[PDB]
């Protein structure tokens, strides 16, 4: 909308681009990570963690 | 344990397959908090491939409710155990009784 | 119907009841009290039954 | 054979004993039943209905 | 270690013989602990003078009658066991009230002694009816702790007393009602903290302040051999 | 910001949430509403747990 | 006018369990002061207790070490009911090296000089294998009551190392308290009871030092009662 738009003007904010869509605890459960798998498509590129 | 039980505990913690039961009675060789290894004794072993009884126990892990199955080692280093014996026991039971 | 919908119902009943009801020989019988105070008084400090 | 059982461990074959209110120390009369139950805890927590 | 002691105590006073005094914020538990010794102390042990014997001019029993006085002679006791006095100095005193001419018989018209004093000189005791109009008793008000009825006077009669000696309840403490109730409270964000509330009723010879003050020192004066 | 703040659960809030619950009441339903008494308001007090 | 009471003879039984006496108690007051003591005894007492733990090459409590025979979980269980008594600080960190098959104790910490332990046959864990050790450091506090690590995230404060272990803290010393009135006849009175007040503790605190300190905090809360400033 123009006041956004006004908005990154006047901040230079430059609205990125990607989205943000990270997986988050949901509320009220604290617990412990204990355990992480991770499973990939063969021919993509593996990254550090896997 | 319950205090007041009804004597068929035993049966139903040992029936489902939630604990470690022996196959081969022998001697506790070495337990560990993720496994038990047992020494058959002679009498139980083939002939060829002497061997022993390793027995890996299921740690902190998903049950289909979320609740977590994990077992823990009964026994102590160097006793002996008889086949049919219960060696780790598994959630919700203690000492091979269906402990609710 | 016009009856209340509020009524105690079990603890609360069963707590009134046995308050309410009395035994035929006990501890502090025949005692002449200047009130209800007084009768709180007397159950509290343990005088009577 | 249960009020036997009690006698065996110098305990009330009634099975009731006498209490004393924790706020004030006065006894309870009427002596009331203790002993011990098996109680679960079933898997209805309340911070899954909530 | 260092534990949270009440601050913003009210006291809120309706109709001076009776007051409602709320203290809060107290640790978890406090609340019964603080509340249920100053009930037991109140109520149970605490030092008055009370009317304790009467012996009327010229009547027997408590089921027997003088022709006369419309009320009954435990009724008469009774009014007399809520008479509320404050002697000065004697431990023991006897007060004589004789009174004649149709009506009323209030506590104000008992013969005035030094140390002795009455707090509600309209608190009937009795009533004379017509033409006779003659009432005499020796009231007996003594210094005693607590409350002690007569059964155990005369099941512990020790003293074989005359004939006419009527014993009544001594009521010896000055409160007259005591109770408190612990609700819930928070310092801004701990909520497990008690309020108590403390409302008491007393025979007027205490202000229920004072009462509540001087039990809290009672109190403090048994456990003075503890504390650092 | 106060969306944020709510997030954050800062101790204002709950000072906040004391003061906009003070007179509101709420509707309270029980699973089968037989009668009109199974909706009931209530005034609420804010409690732990 | 009243009689006060006097601390006499405190019977010790077991290093747990004592029975102490305050002989000249007027009427109606012994169950006064023994039900006061009591509540202030088993709800507010000081004492020192594990907080937490990181164990060496562990980062969570459901994990497991290779040659000990408890999870790690069991082990803080048993680290939770550790007794310990500390001196000069308000908390200390123990440290418990072992290897080699057998229990693991509470003697096998390494001895600090302020730190007492009240039962070193206490069971940490048990090594079985020859060449499986195990090295931790237990940090223990002082405070009182019972405070669990859910709330002490409150003040969780930059707890980055995830090898820290939060255990449940359960400061007080004080297990079980029961007391009884009866009559103590002083050479002439007809009323004098004497309150006898039977305390298990876990060794950690000492009984007259225990009924001293619960008297001051009801001595110190009566001090707000008995000025009514309004």
Same mark, same amino acid.
């Given at each position: 909308?123009?006041?956004?738009?006004?908005?990154?003007?006047?901040?230079?904010?430059? &609205?990125?681009?990607?989205?943000?869509?990270?997986?988050?605890?949901?509320?009220?459960?604290?617990?412990?990570?204990?355990?992480?798998?991770?499973?990939?498509?063969?021919?993509?590129?593996?990254?550090?963690? &896997? | 344990?319950?205090?007041?039980?009804?004597?068929?505990?035993?049966?139903?913690?040992?029936?489902?397959?939630?604990?470690?039961?022996?196959?081969?009675?022998?001697?506790?060789?070495?337990?560990?908090?993720?496994?038990?290894?047992?020494?058959?004794?002679?009498?139980?072993?083939?002939? $060829?491939?002497? $061997?022993?009884?390793?027995?890996?126990?299921?740690?902190?892990?998903?049950?289909?409710?979320?609740?977590?199955?994990?077992?823990?080692?009964?026994?102590?280093?160097?006793?002996?155990?008889?086949? $049919?014996?219960?060696?780790?026991?598994?959630?919700?039971?203690?000492?091979?009784?269906?402990?609710? | 119907?016009?009856?209340?919908?509020?009524?105690?119902?079990?603890?609360?009943?069963?707590?009134?009841?046995?308050?309410?009801?009395?035994?035929?020989?006990?501890?502090?019988?025949?005692?002449?009290?200047?009130?209800?105070?007084?009768?709180?008084?007397?159950?509290?400090?343990?005088?009577?039954? | 054979?249960?009020?036997?059982?009690?006698?065996? =461990?110098?305990?009330?074959?009634?099975?009731?004993?006498?209490?004393?209110? =924790?706020?004030?120390?006065?006894?309870?009369?009427?002596?009331?039943?203790?002993?011990?139950?098996?109680?679960?805890?079933?898997?209805?927590?309340?911070?899954?209905?909530? | 270690?260092?534990?949270?002691?009440?601050?913003?105590?009210?006291?809120?006073?309706?109709?001076?013989?009776?007051?409602?005094?709320?203290?809060?914020?107290?640790?978890?538990?406090?609340? +019964?602990?603080?509340? #249920?010794?100053?009930?037991?102390?109140?109520?149970? /042990?605490?030092?008055?003078?009370?009317?304790?014997?009467?012996?009327?001019?010229?009547?027997? +029993?408590?089921?027997?009658?003088?022709?006369?006085?419309?009320?009954?002679?435990?009724?008469?006791?009774?009014?007399?066991?809520?008479?509320?006095?404050?002697? !000065?100095?004697?431990?023991?005193?006897?007060?004589?009230?004789?009174? /004649?001419?149709?009506?009323?018989?209030?506590?104000?018209?008992?013969?005035?002694?030094?140390?002795?004093?009455?707090?509600?000189?309209?608190?009937?005791?009795? +009533?004379?009816?017509?033409?006779?109009?003659?009432?005499?008793?020796?009231?007996?008000? !003594?210094?005693?702790?607590?409350?002690?009825?007569?059964?155990?006077?005369?099941? /512990?009669?020790?003293?074989?007393?005359?004939?006419?000696?009527?014993?009544?309840?001594?009521?010896? /403490?000055?409160?007259?009602?005591?109770?408190? #109730?612990?609700?819930?409270?928070?310092?801004? !964000?701990?909520?497990?903290?008690?309020?108590?509330?403390?409302?008491?009723?007393? #025979?007027?010879?205490?202000?229920?302040?004072?009462?509540?003050?001087?039990?809290?020192?009672?109190?403090?004066? !048994?456990?003075?051999?503890?504390?650092? | 910001?106060?969306?944020?703040?709510?997030?954050?659960?800062?101790?204002?809030?709950?000072?906040?949430?004391?003061?906009?619950?003070?007179?509101?009441?709420?509707?309270?339903?029980?699973?089968?509403?037989?009668?009109?008494?199974?909706?009931?308001?209530?005034?609420?007090?804010?409690?732990?747990?």
């Amino acid at each position: 909308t123009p006041e956004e738009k006004l908005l990154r003007a006047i901040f230079g904010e430059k &609205a990125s681009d990607v989205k943000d869509s990270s997986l988050r605890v949901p509320n009220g459960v604290s617990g412990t990570v204990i355990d992480v798998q991770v499973f990939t498509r063969d021919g993509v590129e593996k990254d550090k963690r &896997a | 344990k319950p205090l007041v039980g009804t004597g068929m505990e035993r049966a139903v913690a040992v029936d489902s397959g939630v604990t470690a039961v022996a196959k081969r009675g022998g001697v506790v060789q070495y337990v560990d908090a993720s496994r038990i290894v047992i020494k058959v004794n002679e009498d139980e072993m083939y002939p $060829g491939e002497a $061997g022993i009884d390793i027995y890996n126990l299921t740690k902190y892990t998903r049950s289909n409710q979320n609740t977590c199955i994990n077992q823990m080692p009964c026994v102590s280093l160097g006793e002996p155990v008889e086949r $049919g014996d219960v060696l780790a026991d598994g959630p919700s039971t203690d000492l091979g009784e269906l402990a609710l | 119907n016009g009856e209340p919908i509020i009524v105690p119902s079990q603890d609360v009943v069963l707590g009134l009841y046995y308050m309410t009801r009395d035994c035929v020989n006990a501890k502090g019988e025949g005692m002449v009290l200047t009130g209800p105070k007084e009768a709180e008084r007397l159950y509290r400090s343990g005088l009577a039954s | 054979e249960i009020k036997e059982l009690l006698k065996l =461990g110098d305990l009330p074959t009634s099975g009731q004993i006498r209490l004393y209110d =924790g706020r004030t120390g006065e006894q309870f009369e009427r002596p009331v039943t203790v002993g011990y139950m098996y109680m679960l805890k079933l898997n209805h927590l309340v911070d899954d209905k909530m | 270690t260092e534990f949270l002691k009440p601050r913003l105590v009210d006291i809120e006073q309706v109709s001076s013989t009776h007051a409602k005094v709320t203290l809060e914020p107290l640790e978890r538990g406090f609340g +019964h602990t603080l509340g #249920n010794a100053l009930r037991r102390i109140l109520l149970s /042990s605490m030092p008055g003078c009370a009317v304790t014997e009467v012996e009327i001019d010229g009547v027997l +029993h408590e089921y027997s009658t003088k022709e006369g006085v419309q009320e009954d002679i435990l009724e008469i006791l009774l009014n007399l066991k809520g008479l509320a006095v404050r002697v !000065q100095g004697k431990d023991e005193v006897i007060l004589t009230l004789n009174k /004649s001419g149709i009506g009323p018989v209030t506590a104000a018209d008992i013969t005035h002694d030094g140390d002795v004093e009455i707090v509600k000189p309209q608190h009937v005791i009795c +009533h004379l009816t017509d033409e006779n109009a003659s009432i005499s008793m020796r009231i007996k008000v !003594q210094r005693g702790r607590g409350y002690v009825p007569a059964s155990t006077r005369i099941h /512990s009669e020790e003293d074989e007393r005359p004939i006419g000696r009527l014993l009544v309840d001594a009521c010896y /403490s000055p409160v007259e009602r005591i109770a408190y #109730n612990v609700e819930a409270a928070r310092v801004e !964000q701990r909520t497990d903290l008690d309020k108590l509330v403390i409302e008491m009723e007393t #025979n007027g010879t205490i202000d229920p302040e004072e009462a509540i003050r001087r039990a809290a020192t009672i109190l403090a004066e !048994q456990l003075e051999a503890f504390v650092d | 910001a106060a969306k944020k703040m709510v997030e954050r659960e800062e101790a204002v809030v709950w000072d906040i949430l004391d003061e906009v619950i003070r007179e509101h009441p709420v509707l309270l339903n029980r699973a089968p509403t037989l009668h009109r008494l199974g909706i009931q308001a209530f005034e609420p007090v804010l409690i732990e747990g």
